[PDB]
Amino acid sequence: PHKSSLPEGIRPGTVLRIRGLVPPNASRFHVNLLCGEEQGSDAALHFNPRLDTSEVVFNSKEQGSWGREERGPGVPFQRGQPFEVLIIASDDGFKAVVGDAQYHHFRHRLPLARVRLVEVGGDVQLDSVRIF
Amino acid sequence: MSNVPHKSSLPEGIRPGTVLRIRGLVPPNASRFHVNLLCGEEQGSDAALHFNPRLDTSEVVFNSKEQGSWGREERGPGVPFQRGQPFEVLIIASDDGFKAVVGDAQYHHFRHRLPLARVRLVEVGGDVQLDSVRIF
Ligand SMILES: OC[C@H]1O[C@@H](S[C@@H]2O[C@H](CO)[C@H](O)[C@H](n3cc(-c4cccc(F)c4)nn3)[C@H]2O)[C@H](O)[C@@H](n2cc(-c3cccc(F)c3)nn2)[C@H]1O
Protein backbone atom coordinates (compact mmCIF):
# COMPACT_ATOMS: atom_id res chain seq x y z
CA PRO A 1 0.00 0.00 0.00
CA HIS A 2 1.60 3.20 -1.27
CA LYS A 3 1.42 6.44 0.72
CA SER A 4 2.37 9.95 -0.40
CA SER A 5 1.94 13.09 1.71
CA LEU A 6 0.41 16.12 0.01
CA PRO A 7 3.24 18.73 -0.18
CA GLU A 8 0.98 21.77 0.31
CA GLY A 9 -2.25 20.11 1.35
CA ILE A 10 -5.09 20.35 -1.14
CA ARG A 11 -7.21 23.09 -2.70
CA PRO A 12 -9.14 23.43 -5.96
CA GLY A 13 -6.50 22.88 -8.63
CA THR A 14 -4.59 20.13 -6.84
CA VAL A 15 -4.06 17.26 -9.29
CA LEU A 16 -2.99 13.72 -8.53
CA ARG A 17 -1.77 11.64 -11.45
CA ILE A 18 -1.57 7.92 -10.86
CA ARG A 19 -0.03 5.58 -13.40
CA GLY A 20 -0.10 1.84 -12.95
CA LEU A 21 -0.88 -1.65 -14.14
CA VAL A 22 -3.81 -3.86 -13.15
CA PRO A 23 -2.48 -7.36 -12.33
CA PRO A 24 -3.86 -10.25 -14.46
CA ASN A 25 -5.56 -11.71 -11.37
CA ALA A 26 -6.67 -8.46 -9.71
CA SER A 27 -9.81 -8.41 -7.59
CA ARG A 28 -9.95 -4.76 -6.54
CA PHE A 29 -7.72 -1.79 -5.84
CA HIS A 30 -8.27 1.64 -4.38
CA VAL A 31 -7.07 5.20 -4.22
CA ASN A 32 -7.75 6.99 -0.94
CA LEU A 33 -7.47 10.62 0.07
CA LEU A 34 -6.89 10.48 3.83
CA CYS A 35 -7.04 13.11 6.56
CA GLY A 36 -4.17 11.79 8.66
CA GLU A 37 -1.26 9.35 8.76
CA GLU A 38 -2.70 7.23 11.56
CA GLN A 39 -4.50 3.98 10.77
CA GLY A 40 -8.26 4.37 10.43
CA SER A 41 -8.06 8.07 9.54
CA ASP A 42 -11.05 9.61 7.77
CA ALA A 43 -11.14 9.29 3.98
CA ALA A 44 -12.35 12.36 2.11
CA LEU A 45 -12.33 10.17 -1.01
CA HIS A 46 -12.28 6.43 -1.65
CA PHE A 47 -11.99 5.43 -5.33
CA ASN A 48 -12.48 1.70 -5.68
CA PRO A 49 -12.42 -0.13 -9.04
CA ARG A 50 -13.75 -3.66 -8.57
CA LEU A 51 -12.68 -5.96 -11.38
CA ASP A 52 -14.10 -9.17 -9.93
CA THR A 53 -17.63 -7.72 -9.94
CA SER A 54 -17.16 -5.22 -12.81
CA GLU A 55 -18.09 -2.06 -10.91
CA VAL A 56 -16.63 1.09 -9.37
CA VAL A 57 -17.44 2.32 -5.88
CA PHE A 58 -16.91 5.85 -4.61
CA ASN A 59 -17.27 6.60 -0.89
CA SER A 60 -15.98 8.49 2.12
CA LYS A 61 -15.14 7.30 5.62
CA GLU A 62 -15.74 9.30 8.78
CA GLN A 63 -15.24 8.04 12.34
CA GLY A 64 -14.42 4.53 11.10
CA SER A 65 -17.75 4.44 9.27
CA TRP A 66 -18.31 4.43 5.50
CA GLY A 67 -20.82 6.82 3.95
CA ARG A 68 -23.33 6.48 1.13
CA GLU A 69 -21.85 4.56 -1.80
CA GLU A 70 -21.81 6.21 -5.20
CA ARG A 71 -21.59 3.09 -7.31
CA GLY A 72 -22.35 1.80 -10.79
CA PRO A 73 -21.86 -1.18 -13.12
CA GLY A 74 -18.88 -1.25 -15.47
CA VAL A 75 -15.25 -0.42 -14.82
CA PRO A 76 -12.81 1.60 -16.99
CA PHE A 77 -9.97 -0.76 -16.08
CA GLN A 78 -8.94 -4.16 -17.44
CA ARG A 79 -6.91 -6.96 -15.85
CA GLY A 80 -3.43 -7.00 -17.37
CA GLN A 81 -3.72 -3.49 -18.79
CA PRO A 82 -1.97 -0.22 -17.81
CA PHE A 83 -3.91 2.88 -16.81
CA GLU A 84 -3.58 6.57 -16.07
CA VAL A 85 -5.86 8.15 -13.49
CA LEU A 86 -6.31 11.80 -12.60
CA ILE A 87 -7.83 12.89 -9.31
CA ILE A 88 -8.64 16.58 -9.60
CA ALA A 89 -9.84 18.61 -6.62
CA SER A 90 -12.46 21.14 -7.66
CA ASP A 91 -14.40 23.70 -5.65
CA ASP A 92 -17.43 21.40 -5.32
CA GLY A 93 -15.89 17.92 -5.54
CA PHE A 94 -13.27 15.52 -6.91
CA LYS A 95 -13.19 14.78 -10.60
CA ALA A 96 -12.00 11.25 -11.32
CA VAL A 97 -10.47 10.89 -14.77
CA VAL A 98 -9.56 7.55 -16.35
CA GLY A 99 -7.88 7.37 -19.75
CA ASP A 100 -9.27 10.16 -21.90
CA ALA A 101 -12.57 10.84 -20.15
CA GLN A 102 -13.88 12.06 -16.81
CA TYR A 103 -15.39 8.97 -15.21
CA HIS A 104 -17.09 10.56 -12.21
CA HIS A 105 -17.48 13.74 -10.19
CA PHE A 106 -17.55 13.00 -6.44
CA ARG A 107 -19.03 15.92 -4.52
CA HIS A 108 -17.18 16.87 -1.33
CA ARG A 109 -18.34 15.34 1.93
CA LEU A 110 -15.43 16.06 4.28
CA PRO A 111 -13.73 19.47 4.31
CA LEU A 112 -11.18 19.62 1.49
CA ALA A 113 -8.67 21.23 3.86
CA ARG A 114 -8.52 18.07 6.00
CA VAL A 115 -6.88 15.91 3.30
CA ARG A 116 -3.25 15.12 4.15
CA LEU A 117 -2.14 12.15 2.07
CA VAL A 118 -2.90 9.82 -0.79
CA GLU A 119 -3.00 6.07 -0.32
CA VAL A 120 -2.97 3.50 -3.11
CA GLY A 121 -3.77 -0.08 -2.09
CA GLY A 122 -5.29 -3.38 -3.16
CA ASP A 123 -4.42 -5.31 -6.32
CA VAL A 124 -2.41 -2.85 -8.40
CA GLN A 125 1.10 -2.37 -9.76
CA LEU A 126 1.89 1.28 -9.14
CA ASP A 127 4.22 2.95 -11.63
CA SER A 128 4.10 6.52 -10.31
CA VAL A 129 2.18 9.04 -8.22
CA ARG A 130 2.67 12.69 -9.14
CA ILE A 131 1.04 15.65 -7.45
CA PHE A 132 0.62 18.91 -9.37
CA MET B 1 -0.06 16.47 -43.70
CA SER B 2 -1.28 19.75 -42.18
CA ASN B 3 -0.82 21.11 -38.68
CA VAL B 4 -3.75 19.90 -36.65
CA PRO B 5 -5.36 22.57 -34.45
CA HIS B 6 -8.24 22.63 -32.00
CA LYS B 7 -11.17 24.82 -31.08
CA SER B 8 -13.72 23.86 -28.43
CA SER B 9 -16.25 25.79 -26.39
CA LEU B 10 -16.56 25.80 -22.62
CA PRO B 11 -20.32 26.48 -22.26
CA GLU B 12 -20.11 26.33 -18.46
CA GLY B 13 -16.77 28.11 -18.52
CA ILE B 14 -14.04 26.75 -16.31
CA ARG B 15 -13.81 26.65 -12.56
CA PRO B 16 -11.00 26.14 -10.05
CA GLY B 17 -9.94 22.53 -10.43
CA THR B 18 -10.07 22.24 -14.21
CA VAL B 19 -7.41 20.43 -16.23
CA LEU B 20 -6.60 21.09 -19.87
CA ARG B 21 -4.57 18.16 -21.19
CA ILE B 22 -2.79 18.80 -24.46
CA ARG B 23 -0.77 16.12 -26.20
CA GLY B 24 0.96 16.50 -29.54
CA LEU B 25 4.03 16.69 -31.71
CA VAL B 26 6.17 19.72 -32.41
CA PRO B 27 6.94 19.17 -36.12
CA PRO B 28 10.54 19.34 -37.50
CA ASN B 29 10.54 22.95 -38.71
CA ALA B 30 8.13 24.45 -36.19
CA SER B 31 8.40 28.16 -35.43
CA ARG B 32 5.85 28.48 -32.63
CA PHE B 33 2.44 27.35 -31.49
CA HIS B 34 -0.11 28.55 -28.97
CA VAL B 35 -2.76 27.54 -26.47
CA ASN B 36 -5.35 30.26 -25.81
CA LEU B 37 -8.09 30.50 -23.21
CA LEU B 38 -10.48 32.99 -24.79
CA CYS B 39 -13.62 34.77 -23.65
CA GLY B 40 -15.52 34.37 -26.91
CA GLU B 41 -15.50 33.24 -30.53
CA GLU B 42 -15.04 36.72 -31.97
CA GLN B 43 -11.73 37.44 -33.69
CA GLY B 44 -9.34 39.19 -31.32
CA SER B 45 -11.25 37.96 -28.27
CA ASP B 46 -9.86 38.74 -24.82
CA ALA B 47 -7.49 36.08 -23.54
CA ALA B 48 -7.34 34.91 -19.93
CA LEU B 49 -4.26 32.97 -20.99
CA HIS B 50 -2.02 32.96 -24.04
CA PHE B 51 0.56 30.18 -23.76
CA ASN B 52 3.13 30.48 -26.51
CA PRO B 53 6.09 28.09 -26.92
CA ARG B 54 8.45 29.75 -29.39
CA LEU B 55 10.80 27.16 -30.89
CA ASP B 56 12.36 29.75 -33.17
CA THR B 57 13.49 32.03 -30.32
CA SER B 58 13.73 29.35 -27.62
CA GLU B 59 11.28 30.97 -25.20
CA VAL B 60 7.89 30.13 -23.74
CA VAL B 61 5.74 33.23 -23.34
CA PHE B 62 2.68 33.64 -21.09
CA ASN B 63 0.32 36.57 -21.54
CA SER B 64 -3.20 37.91 -21.36
CA LYS B 65 -5.20 40.17 -23.63
CA GLU B 66 -7.85 42.45 -22.17
CA GLN B 67 -9.99 45.04 -23.94
CA GLY B 68 -7.90 44.42 -27.05
CA SER B 69 -4.61 45.17 -25.30
CA TRP B 70 -1.87 42.68 -24.42
CA GLY B 71 -0.54 42.48 -20.88
CA ARG B 72 3.06 42.20 -19.79
CA GLU B 73 4.66 38.94 -20.94
CA GLU B 74 5.87 36.33 -18.49
CA ARG B 75 8.53 33.82 -19.55
CA GLY B 76 8.97 30.28 -18.28
CA PRO B 77 12.37 28.77 -17.40
CA GLY B 78 13.86 27.51 -20.67
CA VAL B 79 11.98 25.61 -23.38
CA PRO B 80 10.59 22.17 -22.46
CA PHE B 81 9.74 21.64 -26.14
CA GLN B 82 11.80 20.41 -29.09
CA ARG B 83 11.29 20.22 -32.85
CA GLY B 84 10.63 16.58 -33.72
CA GLN B 85 9.55 15.64 -30.19
CA PRO B 86 6.13 14.80 -28.73
CA PHE B 87 4.92 16.55 -25.58
CA GLU B 88 2.23 16.61 -22.91
CA VAL B 89 1.11 19.87 -21.35
CA LEU B 90 -1.31 20.27 -18.46
CA ILE B 91 -2.92 23.66 -18.00
CA ILE B 92 -4.43 23.54 -14.53
CA ALA B 93 -6.85 26.19 -13.29
CA SER B 94 -6.86 27.03 -9.58
CA ASP B 95 -8.36 29.85 -7.53
CA ASP B 96 -5.14 31.81 -7.94
CA GLY B 97 -4.02 31.20 -11.51
CA PHE B 98 -2.97 28.66 -14.13
CA LYS B 99 -0.29 26.07 -13.50
CA ALA B 100 1.54 24.84 -16.58
CA VAL B 101 2.93 21.32 -16.25
CA VAL B 102 5.14 20.02 -19.03
CA GLY B 103 6.28 16.38 -19.21
CA ASP B 104 6.03 15.24 -15.56
CA ALA B 105 7.29 18.56 -14.13
CA GLN B 106 5.74 21.78 -12.84
CA TYR B 107 6.86 24.47 -15.27
CA HIS B 108 5.26 27.86 -14.54
CA HIS B 109 2.48 29.49 -12.54
CA PHE B 110 0.57 32.31 -14.25
CA ARG B 111 -1.57 34.32 -11.83
CA HIS B 112 -5.07 35.25 -13.00
CA ARG B 113 -5.41 38.64 -14.63
CA LEU B 114 -8.92 38.16 -16.01
CA PRO B 115 -11.74 36.59 -13.99
CA LEU B 116 -11.75 32.84 -14.61
CA ALA B 117 -15.52 32.94 -15.18
CA ARG B 118 -15.07 34.85 -18.45
CA VAL B 119 -13.29 31.95 -20.19
CA ARG B 120 -15.54 30.30 -22.78
CA LEU B 121 -13.22 28.90 -25.46
CA VAL B 122 -9.99 26.92 -25.89
CA GLU B 123 -8.02 27.20 -29.11
CA VAL B 124 -4.74 25.49 -29.97
CA GLY B 125 -2.99 26.59 -33.15
CA GLY B 126 0.31 27.32 -34.86
CA ASP B 127 3.09 24.88 -35.69
CA VAL B 128 1.85 21.85 -33.80
CA GLN B 129 0.38 18.47 -34.65
CA LEU B 130 -2.12 17.74 -31.90
CA ASP B 131 -2.62 14.20 -30.67
CA SER B 132 -5.48 15.16 -28.36
CA VAL B 133 -7.02 18.05 -26.44
CA ARG B 134 -9.06 17.07 -23.40
CA ILE B 135 -10.72 19.27 -20.78
CA PHE B 136 -11.60 17.83 -17.37
O1 LIG C 1 -18.00 1.79 0.37
C1 LIG C 1 -16.62 1.53 0.28
C2 LIG C 1 -16.33 0.33 1.13
O2 LIG C 1 -17.12 -0.79 0.60
C3 LIG C 1 -16.82 -2.06 1.33
S1 LIG C 1 -17.83 -3.32 0.62
C4 LIG C 1 -19.46 -2.71 0.81
O3 LIG C 1 -19.97 -3.10 2.13
C5 LIG C 1 -21.43 -2.99 2.31
C6 LIG C 1 -21.84 -3.71 3.53
O4 LIG C 1 -22.93 -3.04 4.06
C7 LIG C 1 -22.26 -3.43 1.12
O5 LIG C 1 -22.22 -4.84 1.04
C8 LIG C 1 -21.75 -2.87 -0.15
N1 LIG C 1 -22.53 -3.34 -1.31
C9 LIG C 1 -23.64 -2.78 -1.78
C10 LIG C 1 -24.03 -3.60 -2.92
C11 LIG C 1 -25.23 -3.41 -3.83
C12 LIG C 1 -26.37 -2.73 -3.36
C13 LIG C 1 -27.48 -2.56 -4.21
C14 LIG C 1 -27.45 -3.06 -5.49
C15 LIG C 1 -26.32 -3.74 -5.95
F1 LIG C 1 -26.28 -4.24 -7.20
C16 LIG C 1 -25.20 -3.91 -5.08
N2 LIG C 1 -23.10 -4.58 -3.01
N3 LIG C 1 -22.22 -4.42 -2.06
C17 LIG C 1 -20.31 -3.10 -0.38
O6 LIG C 1 -19.89 -2.42 -1.55
C18 LIG C 1 -15.37 -2.41 1.33
O7 LIG C 1 -15.18 -3.57 2.19
C19 LIG C 1 -14.63 -1.25 1.91
N4 LIG C 1 -13.18 -1.49 2.15
C20 LIG C 1 -12.30 -2.27 1.42
C21 LIG C 1 -11.06 -2.14 2.09
C22 LIG C 1 -9.72 -2.76 1.76
C23 LIG C 1 -8.55 -2.16 2.30
C24 LIG C 1 -7.26 -2.72 2.02
C25 LIG C 1 -7.16 -3.82 1.24
C26 LIG C 1 -8.34 -4.42 0.70
F2 LIG C 1 -8.23 -5.52 -0.07
C27 LIG C 1 -9.62 -3.88 0.98
N5 LIG C 1 -11.29 -1.31 3.15
N6 LIG C 1 -12.55 -0.95 3.14
C28 LIG C 1 -14.86 -0.02 1.12
O8 LIG C 1 -14.43 -0.26 -0.26
Author numbering:
A (entry chain B): 4 to 135
B (entry chain A): 0 to 135
Sentences from the paper on this structure:
Galectin-7 contains two arginines (Arg31hGal7 and Arg74hGal7) at the same polypeptide sequence positions as in galectin-3 (Arg144hGal3 and Arg186hGal3). However, TD139 bound to galectin-7 with only a 15-fold increase in affinity compared with TDG binding, in correspondence to a small difference in the binding free energy (ΔΔGTD139-TDG) of −1.7 kcal/mol. Galectin-7 contains Arg31 and His33 at the positions held by Arg144hGal3 and Ala146hGal3, but Arg31hGal7 is displaced in subsite B and thus does not interact with the 4-fluorophenyl substituent of TD139. Likely hindered by the imidazole of His33hGal7, a much bulkier residue than the counterparts Val31hGal1 and Ala146hGal3, the 4-fluorophenyl moiety turns ~50° away as compared to that in the galectin-3 complex, and vacated volume in subsite B of galectin-7 is occupied by two water molecules. The manner in which the 4-fluorophenyl-triazole moiety of TD139 is situated in subsite E is a consequence of the salt-bridge networks of galectins, i.e., Asp54hGal1-Arg73hGal1-Glu71hGal1, Glu165hGal3-Arg186hGal3-Glu184hGal3, and Glu58hGal7-Arg74hGal7-Glu72hGal7. In the complex structures of galectins-3 and -7, there are similar tandem arginine-π interactions between the 4-fluorophenyl-triazole and Arg186hGal3/Arg74hGal7. Linewidths of all the bound-form resonances were determined as a function of sample temperature to assess the changes in ligand dynamics according to their line broadening effects. These observations are consistent with the resolved X-ray structures and the ITC data of galectins-1 and -3 that both 4-fluorophenyl substituents of TD139 make extensive interactions with residues at both subsites B and E (including π-arginine, van der Waals interactions and fluorine bondings), while in galectin-7 only the 4-fluorophenyl-triazole at subsite E, but not subsite B, forms a π-arginine interaction. By contrast, the interactions between TD139 and the B subsite in the galectins differ such that the number of interactions decrease as: galectin-3 > galectin-1 > galectin-7.
Galectins are small, soluble lectins characterised by conserved β-galactoside-binding site (subsites C and D) within their carbohydrate-recognition domains (CRD, ~130 amino acid residues), and they can form multivalent lattices with membrane-associated glycosylated ligands. All the observed CRDs of galectin family adopt a typical β-sandwich fold composed of two antiparallel β-sheets of six strands (S1–S6, S-sheet) and five strands (F1–F5, F-sheet). Concave surface of S-sheet contains conserved amino residues and forms a primary binding groove to which specific glycans up to a length of tetrasaccharide are bound. In this model, the best structurally characterised subsites C and D are responsible for recognition of the β-galactoside-containing disaccharides, whereas the other subsites (A, B and E) remain poorly understood regarding how they contribute to ligand binding interactions.
